[PDB]
């Protein structure tokens, strides 16, 4: 069970911090994966975080735009977006790696999705 | 400043022989057998891999009844026993034991692989045994022996230990006790507090502490009472090279390799561990059943048994043979049935300690009394309860074993022949 | 012309003992543990396969405060410490480590094959470990130790190096720093700059340089300050015989064989590489925990510690035991789950250096000053900042450790007993 934040409306140039709270398992063993989907369009990979030491990999497209963090004490993942534009309006999803610290065999548990409007 | 005992301890010409009859120990090699509902030990754990610490009790030479007492002045001086010869007799045939674990944490064989190993599921533990590293050693002194081992150090008050975090190490000095285990090839550490797994090593050391004599510390000791003589012989080699199942506690820095793909996409456990093996055991390499002449000690205490005590620590894995004995539940059917026979394991140890003691006298002058007092106040207090009651050791009483006729004993004859006069 | 120090260095009758308390080193056997985002080292790499280079700092005998100073003239002469006895104490139990790589470049087993091996696809790397070659060595001098290793030489300005072209070799002399790696069976070379592969050898030497003491060069050294005494003991044998995956860098001349066909049509990699194995480790073969009396040096510098410095290089793989310690993420379920335990690896090293120094005096005559000046101008300048700041070594300060009572120490007793008077 993963819980994401409610809908956001932010003005161009602003910034947003969105959470994904983990529950029903031991968070301290798993990364968190994040993707992006624009209205009526496909899926794109943003990055994934190892909460333990804050290590993370970036999709080049989201290098300066995205930063990932996580609160081990409360088992929650966070993603912040900077210098928001019309292209950042989309539904964002958090998703757990199937195999502990490995990122193969697909994403087996997804969050409900959080909608962000830049306007 | 500390000084050799030769300074204040006078040597008489009287010599006595003393020896245990024949010590015997029988039990289970890996763990003690006890009542489940109960806690009373029915059968003890007896293994060739344990330390044997003998607490030798000597008759107080001052209370002793010598035929002649003209050799000294009971007013100005006192008497102490000095150990001059020791013979640690061993009695079973030479042989090698073997220890394992039904659920040893052993993923795959990393000594040589033809294809990338599968994938760790849940519990990939195997029933595995090994022949521990060979060790022969003998420590003698008037104080109990001291060992070292790695244990879980106390954490720094900062970053809250996340569950599963690697525990901090700390070299811990301890008193070696009779029954303690010897490093078997996995080093000297406290496996109970450093391995939650409970399956990293064989059952016999699995929830114990393997200790190693802290030779450095003991010899640095100012007075050198803990050990004034020792013999050590240890050898070991790598039999097998394995992998550890479990989850990466610390990941392999990616600057050390090129990411794989497909099968090699996921890194296999690089938490390798070897299986020890103390090679062949031999007569020519025996340390025991030979007399040790403690004439010149490297420490300042030259074999003086203050407190009429004497410690003999031993470890001999050259006679570690375990014998399996099985009894039939029924003596009928002429067809073998594994269910008809109850299989067991037992190991026996046979010792025989022998000593040659030299009577000594100490004129209790001012200086001498000041020195001895500083060194160990109890010396004087006892002269004209147990301080180590908390520890344990094979208690050996020799108060009724002293004999002036060395002639009549094997260690005795050897001594006379060796010392000529 | 160079001359023995016995020529211009006078020997007094004063002797001092000095020793480290007990050095201890704990860390990860293969690589350092650090913060991913960061670069600060959280846990250092500590392996029995690294060199330990101790930079021993001695109190300036000229600034020192002796009870008596009549033994020399502070106007015509100066004082220098001379190393006369060393005891490298080692403290963990004997044992053998083990190193591997999760993606080692090992195609097939070439030691014995029943049918021609398949065909190299993409990434045929295997998770493989091995027991490195045994090495015990001790170098002592007043200058840091120097090693040799093969590295990538500079190319000749001609034929533009085609990518993938074999890199040129060049024996490179270097200063052996504390923490450097010892040849482990793959020779002394720079694997980082000579193996793009990053999978030819185990992780612990994988991106390091394995250096070998350049004994030839150091002994040829005119003044012989870099090393005036040494002990070396190395052994190794071939455990396994493998193949290397990758592509033919240099093809096998066809005059060396008859073309095959079908399966044997295509030649298998003949880029063989063996797996090393330093056999069994033994007490009888120990180099340490024995005193070394540096009385007659083979070089011209007979143990004079110019600069009040002293270098002690050591390598001991006879105590390379690595201990795996795993912590449970949860202490609930009574069913083993590999996911419930985080496995780690740690290795501990224990040292204890002890020395006996002899005070010496040098009357600063003209000739003497010309000589010493040519030899090493700093000598005189310092008499009545760190020149090796670039290099790193285990710093050891003994300025507060000298004692005139050799009597009170184990190495000291040994020395007195050995030298009689």
UniProtKB/TrEMBL annotation, chains B, C:
GO terms for molecular function: structural molecule activity. One of its GO terms (cellular component) is T=7 icosahedral viral capsid. It is found in: Virion; Host nucleus. One of its GO terms (biological process) is virion attachment to host cell. Forms an icosahedral capsid with a T=7 symmetry and a 50 nm diameter. The capsid is composed of 72 pentamers linked to each other by disulfide bonds and associated with L2 proteins. Binds to heparan sulfate proteoglycans on cell surface of basal layer keratinocytes to provide initial virion attachment. This binding mediates a conformational change in the virus capsid that facilitates efficient infection. The virion enters the host cell via endocytosis. During virus trafficking, L1 protein dissociates from the viral DNA and the genomic DNA is released to the host nucleus. Belongs to the papillomaviridae L1 protein family. Keywords: Capsid protein, Disulfide bond, Host nucleus, Host-virus interaction, Late protein, T=7 icosahedral capsid protein, Viral attachment to host cell, Viral penetration into host cytoplasm, Virion, Virus endocytosis by host, Virus entry into host cell. It comes from Human papillomavirus type 16. InterPro entries: Capsid_L1_Papillomavir, Capsid_L1_sf_Papillomavir, dsDNA_vir_gr_I_capsid. Self-assembles into homopentamers. The capsid has an icosahedral symmetry and consists of 72 capsomers, with each capsomer being a pentamer of L1. Interacts with the minor capsid protein L2; this interaction is necessary for viral genome encapsidation. Interacts with protein E2; this interaction enhances E2-dependent replication and transcription activation. It comes from the Viruses. The lineage of its organism: Viruses, Monodnaviria, Shotokuvirae, Cossaviricota, Papovaviricetes. HAMAP family: PPV_L1. This is Major capsid protein L1.
């Amino acid at each position: 069970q993963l819980q994401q934040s409610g809908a956001e409306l932010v003005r161009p140039g602003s910034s947003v911090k969105i959470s994904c709270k983990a529950s029903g398992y031991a968070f301290s063993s798993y990364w968190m994966n994040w993707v992006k989907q624009r209205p009526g369009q496909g899926l794109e990979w943003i990055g994934q975080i190892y909460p333990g030491d804050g290590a993370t990999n970036y999709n080049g497209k989201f290098k300066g735009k995205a930063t990932l963090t996580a609160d081990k004490s409360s088992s929650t993942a966070f993603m912040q977006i900077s210098s928001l534009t019309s292209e950042d309006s989309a539904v964002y999803f958090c998703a757990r790696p199937y195999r502990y610290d490995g990122g193969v065999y697909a994403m087996d548990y997804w969050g409900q999705g959080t909608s962000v409007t830049v306007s | 400043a500390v000084v050799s005992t030769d300074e204040y301890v006078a040597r008489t010409n009287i010599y006595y022989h003393a020896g245990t009859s024949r010590l015997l120990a029988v039990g289970h090699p890996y763990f003690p057998i006890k009542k489940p509902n109960n806690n009373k030990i029915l059968v003890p754990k007896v293994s060739g891999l344990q330390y044997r610490v003998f607490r030798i009790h000597l008759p107080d030479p001052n209370k002793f009844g010598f035929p002649d007492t003209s050799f000294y002045n009971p007013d100005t001086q006192r008497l102490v026993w000095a150990c001059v010869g020791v013979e640690v007799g061993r009695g079973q045939p030479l042989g090698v034991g073997i220890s394992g674990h039904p659920l040893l944490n052993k993923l795959d064989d990393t000594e040589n692989a033809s294809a990338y190993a599968a994938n760790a599921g849940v519990d990939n533990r195997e029933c595995i045994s090994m022949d521990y590293k060979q060790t022969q050693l003998c420590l003698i002194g008037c104080k109990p022996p001291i060992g070292e081992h790695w244990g879980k150090g106390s954490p720094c008050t900062q970053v809250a230990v996340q569950p599963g975090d690697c525990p901090p190490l700390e070299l811990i000095n301890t008193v070696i006790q009779d029954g303690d285990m010897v490093d078997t090839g996995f080093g000297a550490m406290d496996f109970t507090t450093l391995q939650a797994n409970k399956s990293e090593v064989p059952l016999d050391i699995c929830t114990s502490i393997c200790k190693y004599p802290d030779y450095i510390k003991m010899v640095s000791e100012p007075y050198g009472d803990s050990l004034f003589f020792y013999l050590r012989r240890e050898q070991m080699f790598v039999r097998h090279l394995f992998n550890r199942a479990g989850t990466v506690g610390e990941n392999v820095p990616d600057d050390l390799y090129i990411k794989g793909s497909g099968s090699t996409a996921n890194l296999a456990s690089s938490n390798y561990f070897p299986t020890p093996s103390g090679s062949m055991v031999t007569s020519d390499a025996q340390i025991f059943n030979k007399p040790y002449w403690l004439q010149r000690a490297q420490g300042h205490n030259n074999g003086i048994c203050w407190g009429n005590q004497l410690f003999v620590t031993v470890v001999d894995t050259t006679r570690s043979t375990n014998m399996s004995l099985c009894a039939a539940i029924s003596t009928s059917e002429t067809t073998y049935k594994n269910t008809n026979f109850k299989e067991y394991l037992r190991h026996g140890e046979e010792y025989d300690l022998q000593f040659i003691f030299q009577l000594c006298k100490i004129t209790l002058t001012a200086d001498v009394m000041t020195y001895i007092h500083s060194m160990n106040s109890t010396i004087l207090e006892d002269w004209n309860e147990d301080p180590l009651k908390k520890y344990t050791f094979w208690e050996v009483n020799l108060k009724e074993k002293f004999s002036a006729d060395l002639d009549q004993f094997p260690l005795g004859r050897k001594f006379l022949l060796q010392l000529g006069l």
